Each structure stands twice: as C-alpha cells, then as structure tokens.
C-alpha cells in the first residue's frame, strides 16, 4: 500500500517508486536506476542503461528472481503489486528507482 | 465661476498678503498634515446658527431678580455675579429652569462648524456648552471621544478628543454640570483636575489655533497667564484667528504678539460689511483648506525649495527606483524607466516641468539666489545620477546601459576580502563591510556588525541605515534559520550563537518594524516599506503578466530595463534581502521571455511562417536559474544562434568562478555557509558556458578547475563529461586541453591501484568517454604515462587492468601486447567494451551464443543490454535464428527483432532522440516502422517544445 | 523556569491577574514604568545619606550617628546653602556625583519590557546609558525647555532634574526649598507627568513605601474621584515581608502592592534577585503559561476569536494570522503545528471537543462559550488536526444571492423593510451589485453615519473600502448615468482620502482584534495564493514535458480549494472590492491550469468534474478570446460536465435577464455594461451543457431576438447559434425560432438602405443553411407567402430572398426566378452556394475572365480570387486563360500553378480552412504534399492547436 508515491515516467516506460529488492542474481537490498542519454558518444545502441546497485554498483550472469520487494519507510512487502506491474509492462526493469533524463 | 472668481481673486489675495500670513498658512497646513494641528473652537462660531447668548440670560437673570433691565451696557465680571447673586438669593430650581427654557433648543449647524472638521484636526477643544460640534461631527462620519466631565478621561474610547472644557448639557440642564457662575470659575482647578491637565498638555505638545474668540474673552486670558509662566519658548506660540468687523490696531497686534499669541486678522485681508461674520470665517477657512493646492511655488526660487523638501533627505540612499519615485511625489509624473516623465493627473503647476527649464537652459539658471544655486547643483547631481533626464515631449534620445557598480553583484570576491580588512572610517563604511561579510558567508561577524550598526545609528539621525540594517539582520536571521534546519535541525555556528539569535529575534514582527517609527521615517522615506514584505516586486510582476500575454517597436525594453532597476536598488544600497525566491522566478520568467522573444524574432522572413546578451545578461542566468531550467531553455529555443558579446567580461567572470573554485578547494578554504551559496552559482554558471568563445588560458583554467578542483558529491565523474563536452564542442582542444584530460585520466588510473574504488556515477558515463573524446579530436594520440602504467603491469590488480582496457585505444603497441597478455572476451561486459573501443571487427559465433546464455538468464528474469542485441540483430550483425524467441520482454527489443508484431501504441514518444544515423535511416528504410514512427513523431511534434523530433522527421523520414 | 512555574502555581489570585494586566499593557502600550533609586543604587551610585553626612561634617563637625530621620535629610543641605554658600555645595556635588558606574542588568530588564514611557526620579545618567546599549531612542526631558523641544513621543522624564549640564545644585531638586518651590519652578514636567499617570497604567519599580515622592503622588491621586484613574502598581523588593495592615492601608490609599519577599526566600542583602524575581516573572509576555486548566484555554480562544462573530466568513489563510504564526490551517480542515513551543491549546480544544467526557466537567458560562466557539469553528470549515484525520471534506458553499447571479430576489430583498445595519449592509451591497450606485453611495454613507452609535469596526471599515471602490467604479465609469450634482460631491469628499491611511488611523480595537482586515485596502489580498500558484504552474508543467503521469495524488485540490476561499470572503461579507483585475487573472490562470491538468491527465494510458461553481467563474471572469484559447489547446468537449440542472438554470437566468431588460425599457447604462459581459462570456461556454427543449428554446430565443445590437452582430450570432445547435438537436422548435428570425429579417428589408452590418461576412443565408442542414425537407410558409406577394420593385428584398432561395416553395421559386438571373460574380457565387447551378456554361468562366481582368487593373497600379483558382484546381473551370494572373495572390498561385509557387510564401494557416475534397486533392499531389507536410510539421511545433495534427494525420500520412 504505497501507491501514493508511484510515478509513471512515460518516455522510458518505467514506474519510479522506491522499493528495495531481494534477488537471486543471491543478493539483498538491490535498487535500480536508469538513464536517458540522448546522444551518448560511443557508449551498442540503446536509450536506457541500467545501473544496478547493491549498496554500490554490482559489477556484472543475470538472474534476479525478485523474492522480497519492500517499500521504504512504509513497509510490509509490496511484492504482489511489483509482480503485477511486471506482468503488464514488458521492458527491462519495470520498477526503476530513479531516472536521470539526460 | 466661483472657483475662478473666489479662487483666482483669492489667488490675488494670496499675492496680497504680508509675509507672516503665508508662512502661517504653511505652518497650519503642515501641522494638519503631520497631525499637530489642534483647533480650539469658541463661541463666535456657535452664535452663528444662533444659539442663545449669555448676555441674554444675564439680562433675564437681572429681570427676575431686580426688575427694570439695565441698558447700561454690560461690563466685565458683572456677567458672572448676576447669575451668582441669583444663585444665592433665588436658588437653584429657578436657575436650572431658566437654563431649561433658553438652552434647550435645537439649532441646525452652520457650514463653518463643518469647515473646522474639513481641516482634519488632531484634537478639537471647545469652550461651548452646546451640542452643535458633535452634531456637525456626526454628519461627516467622524468619531470623537466627547470628554465633557472628569469621569471620561481614562473612560475615553478613542484617541481623538472633543474636549468640552467648560462642561456640557447632555446629562441635564442644571447649573452644576457646566461653568457658568462666578464661583465655578474660581473653583475650576479643584473641581476639574484632569480635563485641565489634558488641555494644557495638548497646548504645549501641539500647535494651537483659536477660531472662535475675541481678544478680550477671559478664557483666552486664563490660557495667556499660564503660558506666561513658562520659559524661553519651551512652547510654540498659539495662533489666534481674529474675525471681527473693524481691523485691529497695530499696538494691540504688537502687544498680544509678545504676550504669546500670533494674530491672523480676517478684516485686514478682505473688505466687507459690519454684520457679516460667516464670510470672514469662510475667508480664512477657505484660504486654510488648500493643503492640496500648495500655490506657494509661483516663483523660480520656490520650486527649487519644494524639490529640496521632498528629495534632499534622500541623499543618504545610493539609488532609488523610478517606480518608487512615482510614490515619492504623490501620484503625478509616472517616471518611465528610460528617463521620460509623463504627466498623469497634475491639476496645477508643472514644478518638474519648470525644474527642467531652469535646468539645461542656463539663462534662467543665472538669476537664482546664492544658496538656491547650490541646492540646484545638488538636485541636478541627484536627478542626473538616478537616470532622470527630461520630459517625454522633447526627448527622442532615451539612453540605456545601467551600471550596477557593486563588488557583490559582479562576484568579485577578491577585493571584498581586501576591503573588509581595511580600517573603518564611517558607519556607511561598516554598512558596506557588513554587507560584504554577509555576502562572503561570514554571518557571525555580519550579525555582530549589523547589531553594531543598530547600536551605532542611535547617535546620528538616519532612519535608512537603521531600518535597512534591521531588515537585513532579520533576513540573515531567516538565512541562519533556513541554514540550521538543513544543517543540524558541518557545525557552522556554535550553540552559544543559536541561543542568542533565537532569543532576540523572537516576537520581532517585520510588519511592525515600519509603523513604530518617528514621523520623519513615515513620509520622508515612504518608499522603504515594500521591503519588509514581498510587495516589492508587485507592480513589475503584474506588468509582466500582460506582456507574457502580449508576446515596428519591440517591447523587450519594458522588461529588460525594469528588471535592472530591481537588482540595482538592493545591491547599491547594500541590502541582504536577496534570499527570497520570488525574485528568482521573476528573473527566470523575465529572462526566459526575453530569450524566447529574441529567438522567435530571428527566423522571421517577412511574410512569416536587440538583446545582444552582454555581461549583465549572464550573471542573472548564472545566479538565479538552475541547470534544469537552462536545459528547458535549450530544449525549446536554440541559444547557439545568439551572438553573445562582452566575451572579455563574461570570460573574466567565468575565470573568476574558476579561480574561486581553485583557491577554496586546494587545501582548506570551505565554510559550509559560503560553500552552499557559491557552489550553486558555480554550477549554473559553468553549464551556460558553452555560448562564450574562450581563449586558451580562458578555457584551460576553467577545464582544469572543473576536472580537478570541483569537489565531489556535487559533480560526479560521469556528470563532468557533459560539461567538458559542451566546453570542448564550442572551442577546439589546442594540445593543452588534451594535456589536461590526459593528466586527469592518469590521475584516475592511479586511484585504481587499490581495490573497492568504483567511480560512483549517475549517468553511467566514465573515464572511457574521456578517452573517446581525446581520440575524437586527437586521433593519433598516445598517452606516454598510461603506456608506462600498462607496461609496469603484473598479474594482479584486476581493477586497474579493467580500467586500462576501457581506455585501450590510448595505449602503445607494446602496451597493448603486454596488456592483452592478460585479458580476453569471457562475458558481455568485455564484449560491449570490445566493440566500444573498436577491437572486434566481426562476430565469431561463440559471441552470439554467449549472448544466447545471457538472454537465457533474461528468460529466467521473465519467468518469475537487451536493446543493443535486438539492434545488432536489426543491423545484420547477429547471424542467428534463435534470438527471436525472447518476445514480450522489452518493447524496444521487440521493436527491432519483430517489427511487424510489435504493438505500436507501446512505442515510446522517445527512443528516436537516442539513435544514430545508421539506425535512423534503417528504421526509415522499412514499411511499418515508417508508418507508425512517423505518427509517433507527428503527435510528439505536437505535444512538445523540443525541436529535435522535427529534425528527425525532416532529415530522415520525409 | 520550572521552579518558577511552581512559583506560578504558588501565588495568590491577585499576583497572577496583575501579571496579566502588566503584560497586556506592555502589549497595548499602556505600561509606564516609574523607575526609582533602588535600582540605581545597585551598580552603586553615591547615596544621599552619604552626602548629608558630609554636609553635616563640614558644617558642624562630629558626625551624628543618631540614625537619620525624615525631612532632616533636606534641612542639612539647606542650612549649609544658607550658611556656607553654593560654591561649596556644588563642589561636594562635583566630588561625589561625578562618577561613572557601569549599569546593572536590572536597568536593562526594565527596557526589555518595551514600556510606553519611562519616568524617573534619578539624578544620574545610568538609564539613558542603559538605553544607549539596546538601541532605543528616548526624549530625555530633564528641564522645562524640553517639552515641545522634544523630538520623539517616547519620554525619559527625569522629573527631579539632572546633571548633564553641570554639577550645580540649581539643576536638580535636592534642597528643602526645591521641594517646596517645585510646582512653580517646574510647571510643564509636572503636568506631563500627572497626565501620563491618569491615562496609563503606572508601575513603581524602585521605591519604598515611605519615600516622599510616592507620598506626593498619593496625595494628588487622593484628590481624585470614584476611580476616574487606574490604581498604580507598586512592586516592593524589600528584605522583610510586608505587614498585612500596611498591605491593606496602602491598597485603599491607591497603590496595589506586589511584594517580592512573599514570593521567594532569600538573604537580607541580596536585592538583585528580588528585582530579577519579579522581572523575570513579568517578562513572559510570549510564554502566557496561564492556560494550564481546561477552563482557561476556552477563555483564551474566547479572547482571540469571539470579536470575530460579526464577520460571516474568515479565510483559513487569514486564520494563521489571527493566531500568531503557529498552526498553518490547511484549506481541507487539517491543522498542522508549525513552531508552537508550548501548550497545544488548539490540540487541547479538540480534545475537550468531540469527546464529551471532558466536556461535562466545564463550568456554566464556559460551556456556553464552548458552544459558540464550536459553532464558529464548525461553520468556517475547521474540523480536526492532521494526525487523526483521513476524511477531509470538500464542497464549500458560497451562499450569496450576488454570487449566483440570482437577481430576481435581490430586487425583492431591497424593497422590503430594513430592521438592522447588517440588513442595510446587504441591501447596499445588492444595490451596488444591481448597478444602482446612487442609492449605494447614499446608503453606504448612511452606514458610515449609522455605525457611529454601535461598536463594530468591521461594518464601518468595510463599508469605507466598498465606498472607495464604488468611487473608483464611478470614476472608471465616467472616464468611459449620474447627474452633474452627483459627480461634484463624490469628487469633493473622496479627495485626499488615502486608502492606506484608512487602517492605521483607527482605535486599537481595530488594530489587533481584526488584524486580517488590512490586506483589503491594497492588493496584498491574493499575494500568498498567487505565489503558491507559480510553483504549481512549474510543478505541473515540468511533468507535462516529460510525461510523468503521477499515479498517486493530484495537486488540483491545492488550487481549486484555495481559489474558493477567496470568492467566499468577499461575497459572504458583502464586499464591493471585486472590481479589480488581478483577481481575474488569478482565476483565469487558475482555471486554465485546472483544465489543462484535467485534459492532460485523461489520455494517459499507463477529478474536476465541473459542477456549478466551475462555470460561474469562467463566465464572469474570462473573455471570449480566452475561452477560444482554451478550446484551441485543450478539448473541453471530452469533459463530463455535471450539475446540468444547475448550470441550465443559471443560463436561463442569464436568458431571462436579457429577456426582461431588453423588452421595452430596462437598461441602466451602469448595469448593462457589467452584466452584458457576463451574458456574452457565459453564453459562449454554453456548448458543453446538454440543455432541454425549454432550456435551449429560451436561450436561443433570448440570443436571436432579445440580445441587443452593437454588442452582438447578425453574423456574429451565427457562431453562437451553431455551437448551441451542434451540442443539441433541433426539435422542431429551434427550427420555428430560426424560421421566425428569418421572417423577421425578411420584413426589415422592405425599405432601402438596410444592409445587415456584420463583421464575419456571415449573414441570414447561413441561418437558412443550418435549417436545411438539420431539416432537409423544410418549407417556410411565411417566406413562401412573402415571395409570392413580390413585385417588380424592392430590389433588396429580392436579393435577400435569393440568398435564402432553398427555403422556398416551387411556385415561390418560379415567381421569384421570374425576376433574377446570373449577371455578375455575386449572383454566381450565391448560385453555387444555394445549389442552383450544376455545371458551368462558358459565359460564366468568361465573366470570371472580365472580373479577374479588373483584378489585373488592380495589380497594374472581400477577395473572390482563391475561389477561382480552386475551381480551376478541382477541375470545374475548363479554361487555359486563367493561368495568366500569376503574382497577385499567394493562394491563387498555390492552386493555378502548383510547381512555380515559392513555398516559403505558403502561410502557416490555409489548411484549417479547406474542406475534405480539397484537403485530399492537395494530398493527391507531389510538391503540395512535399511542402505542405513541411508547413504542417513546423506549425505542429510552434502551435498549441490540435487541428494541424488532425489534418496531417487524417489526410497526408
């Protein structure tokens, strides 16, 4: 029950909302930020580069069955809604925690 | 007629006066403006609208006591003994019956009980027994505390008094409620103790005007004995207004003048009959009502003194806005910001129009007096300094180029620290030092020295140093409070400090700062009250709203030269009140409107489909914007086609920013109160620095003070890449920026010699990109130091090997041999670094199968780097029929692996600003991508202000 | 502090109320301290018994030691002055009194109380030295020549002389004869002293209950009446506590003693903490720790609220100024704490509210005070805190006859009998709102003359402001109705009346008890609201240009429920100050932001339902071009307008008011100009409401027939009728209305020179088109009879009934076309606009050749040229001559020659102006497609219009 903070950024099709995932890629407290670099000089062909954190970058092999998603400061795990939004929106990382918008 | 016969003939009477009547008109009217005019209304104005006079009653008091009325015309105190002998012989039930017979009438008021009230007096004292004044006060809607008995003084409700000093008949027609008998005049100061003291305190604390009496009249003599028992003009002389038929003898005009009165006679001003009093009272009280007219300036030595009255206190200020000067003078002469005065109402003399004519033409200037000439010199310097030059009629050369000349506006720190450590010689010197200390973050010496200012402006008489140091001390208090609510509630101020500043600034209301002052700071400095609240930028903002709607002659001069007067009143008068964010939004919407106007009016081939950006057009963008606001400007309006001037002044501003980053962040220089102020200006100032063409020493001292000395937690390693890119896409790298960025990468390479150094970065941009940029302008570059680092490389230190594999094209051939004696391709990250530095030309089929296991782990994702594989499948790099199995996992992967089954309303408005020329162009070389991506580009050319989608849709699709 | 809070609890009931009176007079400015010589003998300054001992030493010798009594203090300096002289007297003064002792902190605590005046009997210069270190300016009146030579209205009244002009015995009152000859040597300082005493509250802070000065003030105050005066307060700081008999004796003699040794416990020789003990307990003017019971918070709230029962509404934004800056009242009835370093008196008030078990234990009159305060806070919309409140309510109610435009009852309410001044204040606001400004200015002047007897500074002040704004309405009126006798007296009494000097010239009851009534005399009324719109204008427009559809909580409630409190303070309190145009731009930018927000957040594949109050504001405060700006940008047709029985009765209220006023005679030129703007802007936004047959049929009839000319032209009515008949459908009654309109227009052409003045070029022909746009088989009977009774003459009426030719019968068209034919361009372009030419005979195209030849006569030295190039483009014209007129129009040359037209001369428009067969044969071309797509692309960029996108989607790609 934290849908009062769920924002939908619609130029990368993500759901910016601070959760903290528990994944198997086995890790704990993993949050994802995403970039929107328009004319990234030489940096493949994409819009958005995921920048996975695990209290610091993870340095990537890529599994993350999310087993325990929990909202910050208004807890009691929100895993059901996260799997629901993962079911509808088909993108890499439908729950993103920040967007850079370069 | 009556205004042009009585008025203009009275203007002939204005010319036909002695020199004492006119200055008495000045003193009576200026005290009616100050609130120091007290009228003392008598029984010659209440015997018009005839109310039964006292000699009529003493005659009846002589009639039922003796009989045979006297006719031996009544003298002095015999007025008072006949009502006394009666009271001792006949009684009081006959006395109070004759009072009830004659005094119980209702006479309607004359117009000269209303002309006294039309003067707006502070107090009204009267010796009248009747109720005609308060009846005349009732018909104008004025409330007077009628104090007619002794139990009314602290039981009074308002501070406006109708002081009936001889009693009243509102509580019964008895002879004990008034002062009529002889014993009531002898026993007055012991029956009436509080009304007498309150009367004679008003007399020695105001200006008293007698309006109903004669120069006999024992009441006036009772006030002339008491005022004779005083000193060497402790008091001010009462003014007597004598309205009698005969003119006054000259000896009784000299005698009463030294006895204390100052007689304004009403029969030595007009000519009339014997029995017409109403137009003598009207003759002085139509000539005294002209507090609005002020027809005293009909000479060329009196307009110069009117202007020396309303301007000459304002020489202690260093600048005054024009918008405030239409309040300095009352609401005529709207001063336009180009120095052109327009008349607004001004039903009278053009004293400014006369002042300009006794200005520049010198043949009217020579005929002035001596001290009037010096007053003209000071006023000429004042009006010349502020930017007022002429009228609007004979003025076509309206000038520009204001000058905020203050060390705090230009960001010239560098001299403030030198000016503060000098010796102080004044309070205006300490007021600048305290503003500089406050602007340098040194708020402790600022609050101490501002408190020293409010304790040192007690001896001098200047209510514009004290008041403005008060406001600044309150806004620095709000800066300390807004500071510690982010800082504590990194120890900027001690806990002893935060106690005493939250001890004395408690219950200090800012709105009660102005209306608790002496009257000298009520009218002479009246424009200093929009500053204690945010009614400062009101008129300007509501004259931006219409222009924001509204956008031959352009209207950018109205915005650009009215903003500049706001930045000039604060910094030139050294005001700390710049820490509020409505000024910021005013500048952002102002400058944003000016840039959109100047860009809109640039592509206008006339039939369709200045703002040269000098030095002051950059400081405001720097200090008051944000980086996202400048990005909002660059997304909408192309500022690169602007023709920025003063590029020796903006360059010295930006190397001033660069040296201040250099000095403060070298060993130890950061106050946490000055760092937080300054580092926002250094950020917003260096993002808008692409538009200036710098030198080699100009660029090379900004790039070095951004890569090396600009501190972390406020500019990330990959966040510096955008900024370096902009500053090296405007200029070209002259083998010195190459040495800087090379020295930066060697510095980053030596920070990876230990583990757990990870280069925290938001963008995902890293030192690799710096290597790309170096081999984007310097294709044949070989870093010597990076070559030596890789040649001294061993089996261990796995982080430094990876760092010097991201930077692999900047190496030598022995360095790449010894360096690729350690690494190879074993995963996705080495592959996508492999073709990002260039060293894989064609895929061997183990790479694509490695991508198959990677995307298989992406299938492990979807059961409970992808777009770069679909596009490699789309640009015919991947040679595989297996990769089309991962459908429904990304919308951008499914846009490229399967471009006939992707649902194109799931196609994001973006993704087209993110593709290169070979991709945009093989999207365009398709059927349904063209059909739906053109529709996406069309609707997002509608719902956007960005000009990039139009460039995509023009240059590649149609 | 807390031990002194135990001392706060350990007082008799007189000390506490004296703390209340001393501090409330320090707030009012009626606190005068009378500072003595027991506070200036700390920081020891040489006492008088020391000098009389030296005066006894060089006069007799052998000092006395028989401890000094009464007036013997004054005769030893007198015998000296008669035997030794004055050059020895003034030398001993120069020896002992010429010192510099630095001030104690209790010369500063007197100054920390903010007194109105400071009177002192001290000879020294330690008070003004202590005044110098705080930055306070006092007019030091120490001799008789200083009273009107004083500079400020704050006095340091040294009543016994001073030593600033020399250490002589003639500048002070020291000898015995100087006390006998005081009221004749010192006449003005004495009167100014004893006038302050009987016009303030006096507090003695340095004396003893002997002390001949106090007895001199106790004889004079005994010669007064039955408490004419207020009793002086004595603050006694002595070692021993006071006897009870001398506390009763001096209490009736005039003093009221607050003892300082019956409050603390201390030594014999420590005075500084007794003076500190009372003057640290008196400084708490901010603390007000008197409300520690549940019958004293209810009286604090009955002190700061209960004067405001004469107002009918108060804004929340003003209520955070009513109470000082704690408790920011949010507009949803949720109170948040802001600073409040003390008691939660509002938090306690809500707890002695709804829970009744704390409510029963109140007193009797405290319970009734609670009932009145509960009704007050319930009425204005304050309900709870922010913690235990999730049900925050909505739906405010401006219930005023003037807001709803319900005229109809105002005219009935005015003609009733008046029973009050609040009744006349509503009648005067209704007369002012009905345009009847003469009886308004008369009755408002009757209000300011009738609010002199009652005590209400919110009827008088607000009738003053309204009288000034109706004066600005009369002035703004006559600069663009009233007799010349009227304009003289209103420009006689409103001269030099400053509006900013209206507030700060009032009694102190209207200075603090009604403090929120000062943002109205200037335009600082909508300040906070406007600067909390600027950020929201950023906050919802920065997230439109990046597509951040917030799935959480919208911020339209912040704008929409803060606007509504502004419209409710003015109309419910009956204020005329609605004639200013910053309120208008606030509503336009507010409602414009709400419509763009509600339309932006509608097409979001991942409230603002527009009730009755969401229409009155658009109607009264917009313009027709502003509504067109909204319709060009955001499609309001996809909004789901509710309350369509309330907006419908509003719009038939507008329609009946047009009906009544414009029937025979009803138009005041002062009420017409106000109302007819609302009737225009209200009836243009009337497409969005689904009307009935009686709803539509009474608006259409009150627009075609009764809406007066010079403000709505004949062709200007066609847009409005089109909108109101594209929302609904014509139920054979609108057809009867528009038919009756055309028969009315046909009979106005029976005489010459009637020309139907119209801006748009739209005429009665178009009304005929619309009738045969929904009623294809319509035959007007009356127009048929008019054309059947037609003769050879009356050439205007024949032309009118040739523009309306398809609405006729067959005998009417035979007899009617027995007069006309095609002889020029205008009959041809009416010919194919009513339909009766199917194909061009080649004399028509040659007639166009002579017409465009006269256009060549134009180019050598109502444009019909583009309609010839498009007829050449849609393959109607069969001619090779018409391509010779190149370089005369850019739109003719766009169609006659679509390969030589320079396409940067192609106008951004012209594409919103073409039909489906033209847009579609433009698209069926090569260079028209190539350049018109580029024009459409760049003008899909630099526009907010959604029509160019519809052209470029539906026809080009």
Numbering used by the authors:
A (entry chain C): 9 to 33, 38 to 55, 58 to 74, 78 to 119
B (entry chain B): 6 to 494, 504 to 565, 577 to 634, 644 to 898, 912 to 1005
C (entry chain A): 12 to 491, 506 to 631, 644 to 898, 910 to 1005
Provide the authors' original text about this structure.
DSR2, a Sir2 domain-containing protein, protects bacteria from phage infection by hydrolyzing NAD+. The enzymatic activity of DSR2 is triggered by the SPR phage tail tube protein (TTP), while suppressed by the SPbeta phage-encoded DSAD1 protein, enabling phages to evade the host defense. The protomer structure of DSR2 revealed an architecture that consists of an N-terminal Sir2 domain (residues 1–298) and a long C-terminal helical region (residues 299–1005). The Sir2 domains of two side-by-side DSR2 dimers contact each other to assemble into a head-to-head rod-shaped homo-tetramer of DSR2.
In comparison with that of DSR2 alone, the map of the DSR2-DSAD1 complex displays an extra density on the C-terminal cavity of DSR2, which corresponds to DSAD1. However, the resolution of DSAD1 and its binding region in DSR2 is relatively low, posing challenges for model building. By employing local refinement focused solely on the DSR2-DSAD1 interaction region, the resolution for this specific area was improved to 3.2 Å. The sidechains of the majority of DSAD1 residues were distinctly visible, enabling successful de novo construction of the atomic model for DSAD1 and the entire DSR2-DSAD1 complex. The DSAD1 structure comprises one α-helix and eight β-strands, forming three intertwined β sheets, which deviates significantly from the initially predicted AlphaFold2 model. In the interface 1, a long flexible loop between β5 and β6 of DSAD1 is embedded into the cavity of DSR2, while in the interface 2, the body of DSAD1 locates on the top of the cavity. The aromatic sidechain of F59 from DSAD1 inserts into a hydrophobic pocket constituted by the sidechains of I918, W919, L922 and L966 from DSR2. The side chain of N21 from the DSAD1 establishes two hydrogen bonds with the nearby sidechains of S957 and K960 from DSR2. The first helix of the HEAT repeat domain and the following repeat R1 directly contact DSAD1. This region contributes a β strand that is disordered in apo structure to form a three stranded β sheet with β1 and β2 of DSAD1, rendering the partially opened cavity closed.
